[PDB]
């Protein structure tokens, strides 16, 4: 009877999200390889890359959300998909070209050639990231709410499945692309990424059209200029009832306590090897999946607004271990310090992902449909704004005493975000 389930719009949404997330992770891995290789030992350009991406989203999120609000759903979805995939394909061709001629670019040309290659790569990657943000808004904040009926358990299960998909992709995609870059060449990996995006674009295009055909309600939308739209969107975001919950979710991005950040190099400094690091990342993904399961259970039990409180309490309770580990023997501010630090990180993943699922469902339940895009656009502009701040703090303080300082700062930001959520929750109830 799976032949019936495999043709439902819900599974088609899951499949398209899986393809998009896989391609996006392989693309981010290729860009990281390009930055580490052709621009190592440079600090100005890493900061420029992060600043360009985060500041473009910070300036254009309300504009992209208004564009999603003002147009037909199938049009904006297929347009965002085509723009993102064509950008990644062209940038991957350019990347394999610069990887083929790496030592010539480093040794026997004027430096403006390599500078122009960097400028072109950063620009095309910025365009692809803006298209990915438009896709995330239109699909995970609009289409999924429509494919779910009025039912809230269905929306919750769909959000949890989407989170499990990206939790698995976050560990699996980098492994595959790195094995392709060792068993072959980085040129081979860039060509594979370009071909993967070229095929996945067509498959996801047909998948979006099929979901649009199976969901008639998607065809029924409810209804200098750019500066006025920007100001109106930010003022509309400030006056939302769920504004404090979104502010706390954005404050959660100002953190160092994860395996995507500089904790990996700190673990190398503390004597752990790469196999232990892979085991810890796998345990972290396991705890994130456990957090999705805990979100569905607690939402069935205590409701959504209390699920957010319980998730924030769990996350702070697990970060207490990191706070203690910074003040323990073997801290460079013995195995006892890193043990408590990584134990707190892996344990806090549960409450982190439960709280993220909670704020996501609050945003998609309590925002007016005609405002669904622009509000979420400003929400993206908030998240990146606190991500970019972390991206600065890590760059200016890259030595081990600063690691403990940054850990204390990240725990304080997590506490500030949960305090804002507690204010919203005490207001709501």
């Amino acid at each position, epitope marked *: 009877s799976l032949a019936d389930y495999l043709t439902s719009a819900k599974f088609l949404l899951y499949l398209g999200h899986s393809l998009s997330t896989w391609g996006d992770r392989m693309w981010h891995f290729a860009v990281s390889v390009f930055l580490v290789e*052709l*621009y*190592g030992n440079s600090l100005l350009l890493t900061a420029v890359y992060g600043l360009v991406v985060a500041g473009s989203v910070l300036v254009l999120g309300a504009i992209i959300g208004d564009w999603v609000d003002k147009n037909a759903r199938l049009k904006v979805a297929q347009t965002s998909l085509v723009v993102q995939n064509v950008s990644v394909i062209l940038c991957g061709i350019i990347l394999m070209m610069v990887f*083929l001629h790496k*030592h010539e670019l*480093l*040794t*026997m040309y004027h430096g403006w050639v390599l500078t122009s290659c960097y400028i072109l790569i950063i620009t095309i990657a910025n365009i692809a990231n803006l298209a990915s943000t438009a896709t995330a808004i239109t699909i995970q904040r609009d289409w999924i709410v429509v494919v779910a009926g009025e039912d809230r358990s269905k929306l919750a299960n769909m959000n949890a499945t989407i989170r499990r998909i990206d939790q698995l992709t976050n560990i699996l995609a980098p492994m595959a692309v790195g094995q392709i870059m060792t068993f072959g060449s980085p040129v081979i990996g860039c060509g594979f990424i370009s071909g993967w995006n070229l095929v996945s674009m067509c498959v996801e295009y047909v998948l979006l059209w099929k979901v649009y055909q199976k969901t008639p309600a998607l065809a029924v939308k409810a209804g200098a200029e750019p500066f006025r739209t920007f100001r109106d969107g930010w003022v509309s975001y400030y006056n939302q009832p769920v504004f404090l919950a979104g502010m706390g979710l954005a404050f959660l991005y100002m953190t160092v306590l994860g395996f995507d950040c500089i904790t990996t190099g700190y673990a190398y400094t503390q004597g752990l090897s790469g196999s232990i690091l892979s085991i810890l990342m796998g345990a972290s993904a396991i705890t994130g999946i456990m957090g999705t399961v805990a979100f569905t259970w607690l939402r069935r039990k205590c409701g959504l607004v209390r699920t957010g409180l319980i998730s924030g309490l769990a996350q702070l309770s697990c970060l207490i271990l990191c706070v203690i580990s910074v003040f323990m023997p073997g801290s460079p501010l013995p195995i006892i310090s890193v043990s408590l630090l990584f134990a707190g990180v892996i344990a806090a993943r549960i409450g982190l992902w439960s709280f993220d699922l909670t704020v996501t469902q609050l945003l998609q339940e309590n925002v007016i449909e005609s405002e669904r895009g622009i509000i979420n656009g400003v929400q993206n502009s908030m998240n990146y704004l606190l991500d970019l701040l972390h991206f600065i703090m890590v760059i200016l303080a890259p030595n081990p005493e600063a690691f403990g300082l940054l850990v204390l700062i990240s725990v304080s930001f997590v506490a500030m975000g949960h305090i804002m959520y507690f204010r919203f929750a005490q207001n709501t109830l």
Partner: antibody, heavy 118, light 112 residues
């Protein structure tokens, strides 16, 4: 299994032109960099220049000799001509590949020795 | 041009001991993640054969006894343990910019 092989005359008189050939097998001279190097009586190795996969050439400007580097893609050979030689061009001459995914002298010929004297 | 200064010009070493050959550049040879120093071995009558490239990569077939290190302007080739067959002349060579230039050579002699 790339192989290079130098050939040319063993003796040249002062003020004549000398032309050496590097014959390449196992790989096409249209992919990498193709260099000339010589070793003087003594231990001193001197880079002379290259011709590239695209037919672009570079000559070491610190040379006291005037040289031309050319190639023939239908034979997969390339060539070094030295104009008006002197006694100080007496040397052992090597051709060598430099790869794009390597960036050093990863394959060498065995060398041919030339004496300039009247 | 960039000038490469090898040291010592002649190195006598008893079998089984270690040999240390150094090479110093007038300017840096590192660009980005790489270092453009390479090491070659030449025995008499033979052409030079590559030993270590990008200043720490082992050429295929080269015994593990050979290793390299360094960065910027200072580089070192190490041979531990030395064997009879290493009696030979070793050269450093930079690739950072044109014209390419070689160090003056270090002849490795087996001390009696």
């Amino acid at each position: 299994e790339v192989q290079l092989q130098e050939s040319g005359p063993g003796l040249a008189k002062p003020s004549q032109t000398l032309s050496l050939t590097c014959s390449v097998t196992g790989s096409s001279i249209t992919s990498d960099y193709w260099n000339w190097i010589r070793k003087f009586p003594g231990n001193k190795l001197e880079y002379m220049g290259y011709i590239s996969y695209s037919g672009s050439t570079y000559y070491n400007p610190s040379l006291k000799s005037q040289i031309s580097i050319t190639r023939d893609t239908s034979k997969n050979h390339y060539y070094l001509q030295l104009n008006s030689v002197t006694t100080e061009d007496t040397a052992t001459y090597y051709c060598a590949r430099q790869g794009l995914r390597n960036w050093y002298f990863d394959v060498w010929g065995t060398g041919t020795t030339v004496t300039v004297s009247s | 041009d960039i000038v490469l200064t090898q040291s010592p010009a002649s190195l006598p070493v008893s079998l089984g001991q270690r040999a240390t050959i150094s090479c110093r550049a007038s300017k840096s040879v590192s660009a980005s993640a790489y270092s453009y120093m390479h090491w070659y071995q030449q025995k008499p009558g033979q052409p030079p054969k590559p030993l270590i490239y990008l200043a720490s990569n082992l050429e295929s077939g080269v015994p593990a006894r050979f290793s390299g290190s360094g960065s910027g302007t200072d580089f070192t080739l190490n041979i531990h343990p030395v064997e009879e067959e290493d009696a030979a002349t070793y050269y450093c060579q930079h690739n950072r910019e044109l014209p390419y230039t070689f160090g003056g050579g270090t002849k490795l002699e087996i001390k009696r």
